[PDB]
Amino acid sequence: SGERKISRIHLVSEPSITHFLQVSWEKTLESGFVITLTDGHSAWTGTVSESEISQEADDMAMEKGKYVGELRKALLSGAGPADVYTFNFSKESCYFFFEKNLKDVSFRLGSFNLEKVENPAEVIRELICYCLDDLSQLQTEVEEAVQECRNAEEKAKKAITDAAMMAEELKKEQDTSAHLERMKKNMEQTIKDLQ
Amino acid sequence: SGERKISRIHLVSEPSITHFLQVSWEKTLESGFVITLTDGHSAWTGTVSESEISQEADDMAMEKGKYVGELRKALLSGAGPADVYTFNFSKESCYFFFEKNLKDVSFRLGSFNLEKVENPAEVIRELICYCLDDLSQLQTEVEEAVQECRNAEEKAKKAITDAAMMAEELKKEQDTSAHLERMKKNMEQTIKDLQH
């Protein structure tokens, strides 16, 4: 099996409508991935090999592991902290390239050539089926995460009860010790006056 | 205040292609809903009013509550293996009717009069956007539960650390008490020797 990530993007040439990007890989995005773009009517598909990823990461002076982290933020929709990414696609040449905006820099991150799919309806139906499967998967993870929260709250409740009983036993013992010291002081007086 | 449910269905006339049924309503399903059917290329939409739902329950001689329960299982994917529902759609008439299947028989539960949407791509894009909105909301619900789980683990660690500190103090106090009772044993014996 593999892993996917379906994301919304807005093309620079078409800011009015929303496009959808589907990226799928095997174990890591670093070993290559298939990328599919659709507008709800047509679909375009491309493949990026591991060699192309290592080469594009080398055309720019950039550690390869760090470059994959930029692909994940750009193509897998993980760039929340005030990052600006742009996506460009010509439906006449099928050339897709994306850039990263900093301070009017807009430097190129990567690019690939897509191809118009002859069965867009089947690709779109497959995309909707994964979203529905991902919704059912994520609903069970909500219930499991809520159950883990209640299990931890009961473990915290037990830990607080045990700490309170621990304090109670410490109080009793230092009271016992202080009372024994008074008995010792009394017996030392009994010994002192028996002489 | 609108709710929505998107389900995978298979039409009787097209078993090899998966269709999608989008049901949206406002207050309750009983008060009327909107149907959208798509195959990834085309889209058909229609509306069912509260009066038509009540009329369909009357046509089947059952109380509206039990009929709406059947609507919920057939149209909102609220059915298990004990309930089987089939779906029929003719692209020429745009007439959609669904049935319940028991043993070797089937009977009508309801129907919609759909119409082909002239801009299905916008309908399909809006449907996918909703699924991605729902995925993001469930993602935050996991992160909120995981965070509340971490908050409970921090309270436990503090209580465990506090208890362990008091546990070592208890042992120190117990050793002090045992030392005092040993002196208490010696002094009580020397007291009896001074008495004798």
Task: Determine the distance in angstroms separating the CA of A43 from the nearest CA of chain B, rounded to an integer.
Answer: 11
CA angle A104, A72, A83 (to 5 degrees): 30
Q: What is the CATH number of the domain that holds B14?
A: 2.170.210.10
Whole-angstrom distance, CA of residue B153 vs CA of residue B147: 10
Angle at which helix A120-193 crosses helix B120-195, to 10 degrees, equals 10
Provide the 3-class DSSP secondary structure of residue A123. helix
B13 and B109 part of one domain = yes
Which of B20, B23, B123, B149 should one mutate to test binding to chain A, selecting the residue with the greatest count of A CBs within 10 A? B149
The answer on B108 and B79 residing in a single domain is yes
Closest approach of A19 to chain B, Cα-based (Å): 8
Two structure tokens written together for B127: 């449907």
Instruction: Residue window 40-79, chain B: list those with CB within 8 Å of chain A.
Output: 40-41
Nearest CA in chain A to B19: A125
Contact residues, chain A, for B127 at CB < 8 Å: 128
- Domain identity same for B71 and B156: no
- The span from the CA of A166 to the CA of A124, in Å, is 62
State this model's resolution in angstroms. Answer: 2.5
Q: What does the DSSP assignment read for A20-69?
A: EEEEEESS-GGGEEEEEEE-SS-EEEEEEEHHHHHHHHHHTT--HHHHHH
Q: Which residue range(s) make up the domain with A58? A: 1-119
- Sign of dihedral through CA atoms B176, B181, B184, B186? negative
Where residue B141 sits, what CATH number does that domain have?
1.20.5.370
Contact B10, B19 (CB under 8 A): yes
| A132, A156, A160: residue with CB nearest B6 | A132
Give the residue ranges of DSSP H helices in chain A: 50-59, 64-75, 120-193
Residue type, A15: P
* Sign of the C-alpha dihedral computed for residues A102, A6, A30 and A14 taken in this order: negative
- The reply to whether A104 and A138 lie within a common domain is no
- Please indicate, yes or no, whether residues A3 and A77 belong to a single structural domain of this protein: yes
Same domain for A42 and A56, yes or no, is yes
Cβ atoms of residues A19 and A36 within 8 Å: no
Give Cβ neighbours of residue A79 (< 8 Å, ≥ 6 apart).
Answer: A73, A85
Q: Do B183 and A183 touch (CB under 8 A)?
A: no
Q: How far is CA A105 from the centre of its chain?
A: 27
- Asked whether residue A195 is domain-assigned, the answer is no
Identify the residue whose tokens are 């909102």: B76
Asked, for residue A114, whether it belongs to a domain, the answer is yes
Written in H, E and C, the secondary structure of A57-75 is: HHHCCCCHHHHHHHHHHHH
Chain B contact set for A195 (CB, 8 A): 194
Q: Work out how many domains chain B is built from and give that number.
A: 2
Residue at A108 is within a domain: yes
Name residues whose C-beta falls within 8 Å of residue A180's C-beta, 6 or more positions apart in sequence: B177, B180, B181, B184
Note whether residue A178 is domain-resident: no
The answer as to whether B91 is a domain residue is yes
A106 with A168, same domain: the answer is: no
Strand partners, B48: B33
Measured CA to CA, the distance from residue A57 to residue A60 in angstroms comes to 6
CB atoms within 10 A of CB A44: 21
Task: Say if B121 is an interface residue toward chain A (CB within 8 Å).
Answer: yes
| Cross-chain CB nearest to B139 (options A8, A124, A138) | A138
Experimental technique for the deposited model: X-ray
Q: Are the CB atoms for B88 and B96 separated by under 8 Å? A: yes
Q: Write the CB contacts of B43 (distance below 8 Å, at least 6 apart in sequence).
A: B36, B37, B116, B117, B120, B123, B124
Strand pairing class (A107-113; A115-116): unpaired
* Non-local CB neighbours of A176 within 8 Å, separated by 6+ positions: B173, B177
From the number of C-beta atoms within 10 Å of its C-beta (0-12, 13-18, 19+), residue B143 rates as exposed
Rounded to an integer, what distance in angstroms lies between the CA atom of residue B178 and that of residue B72? 73
Both A45 and A137 in one domain: the answer is: no
B169 and B77 in a common domain: no
With respect to residue B76, please indicate whether it lies within any of the assigned structural domains: yes
How many C-beta neighbours within 10 Å does residue A74 have?
22
Alpha carbon distances (Å) from A64 to A26, A33, A49, A51, B169: 18, 16, 14, 12, 54
User: Rounded to the nearest 10 degrees, what angle do helices B50-59 and B64-75 cross at?
Assistant: 110
B136 SS3 class = helix
Residues 6+ apart with CB under 8 A from A74: A85, A98, A100, A109, A110
Joined together, the tokens standing for residue B178 give 């045992």
* Distance from C-alpha of A97 to C-alpha of A19, rounded to nearest angstrom: 14
Contact B28, A112 (CB under 8 A): no
A76: which DSSP letter? T
On chain B, the residues whose CB falls within 8 A of the CB of A16 are: none
Residue B129 sits at the chain A interface (C-beta within 8 Å): yes
Task: Report the distance separating Cα B149 and Cα B163, nearest Å.
Answer: 21
Structure tokens at A153: 């709250």
Distance CA B59, CA B67 (A): 11
* A126 and A43 within one domain: no
Q: In this structure, what is the dihedral angle of CA atoms B24, B26, B30, B34, given to the nearest 10 degrees?
A: -30
Structure tokens at A57: 């990461």
Q: B44 with B103, same domain?
A: yes
CB proximity list for B130: less than 8 A, separation 6 or greater: B4, B6
Instruction: Of A73, A3, A67, A56, give the one whose Cα is nearest residue A33.
Output: A3
Distance CA B26, CA B3 (A): 6
At a CB cut-off of 8 Å and minimum separation 6, what does B1 contact?
B26, B27
Residues of A within 8 A of B181 (CB-CB) are 180
The residue out of B104, B119, B134 marking a domain boundary is B119
